[PDB]
Design a protein around this ligand. Sequence first.
Ligand code: HEC
Ligand code: HEC
Lengths: 126, 126
Amino acid sequence: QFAKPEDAVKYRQSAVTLMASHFGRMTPVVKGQAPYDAAQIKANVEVLKTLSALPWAAFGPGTEGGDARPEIWSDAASFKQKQQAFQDNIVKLSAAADAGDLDKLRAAFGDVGASCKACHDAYRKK
Amino acid sequence: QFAKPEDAVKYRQSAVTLMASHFGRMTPVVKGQAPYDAAQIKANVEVLKTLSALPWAAFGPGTEGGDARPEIWSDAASFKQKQQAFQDNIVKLSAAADAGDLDKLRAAFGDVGASCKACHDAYRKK
Ligand code: HEC
Ligand code: HEC
């Protein structure tokens, strides 16, 4: 869907920006600093689920640029693995949110955050 | 969810960037320059539906900046009207996509694009 590779860069940066906001805005809730409203979180995690699927299609072939390391393309199977692990952890977070269980939500949230960091440590230019 | 108003600006710009891509990527399909796959479009319009709800909450009070005109806040009822008309037209586009009907899709797509433009003409700094 991108006329030029820069367009893919701008898309994926916007997608991870929105993902980061929908993930990170729950930090005060997981920590107990903000109240836990099960329906609020269920709805937010549904948004995060949609968003978390979107960046990966904007790392198509020839879309090198931004802060993506070139390893994303030369090691396509390792990157796909990191994306799928991340989205599988999103599935666990959805299940926690849908169950309305703050303890499960906390655990799942920390697993998702670790899978964000693991991808960045390997595939994001510092 | 925004620590500073700039964060709201960066969110809403990313949200409308993603919305614009999910809308505009269908242009070749509506024009017949690319094939029409009903399931492909249904799924894309589901993504667009989610995204089209997201910018508006990032124009909260005190979040003046970017290319938003100040009129968004002083005329809150007129802006809300423009957002709701836009999202109602998104509902019509979802119904067309869910029906698998290219003629209805075409019509609905042009209504959505007109409601993008109408908001920009009043509320987006040139
Ligand atoms: C790989 C499988 C990733 C996962 C999982 C997550 N992110 Fe990431 N992110 C990744 C890359 C390769 C990049 C660089 C993109 C580019 O072309 O520049 C990023 C970038 C970010 C950013 C910065 C965006 C900006 O516009 O500056 C943020 C804020 C970010 N990523 C956040 C983030 C979060 C919170 C994640 C899990 C919920 C997450 N990312 C996962 C690769 C990958
Ligand atoms: C008001 C009810 C709007 C509707 C409907 C749409 N958009 Fe818009 N858009 C609006 C504003 C106020 C702004 C400025 C935001 C800011 O703070 O800077 C925008 C901006 C855009 C942009 C530019 C984003 C950038 O990062 O440069 C694009 C590409 C854009 N909008 C696209 C777009 C499309 C395609 C729409 C319908 C599908 C649409 N917008 C509707 C306000 C409103």
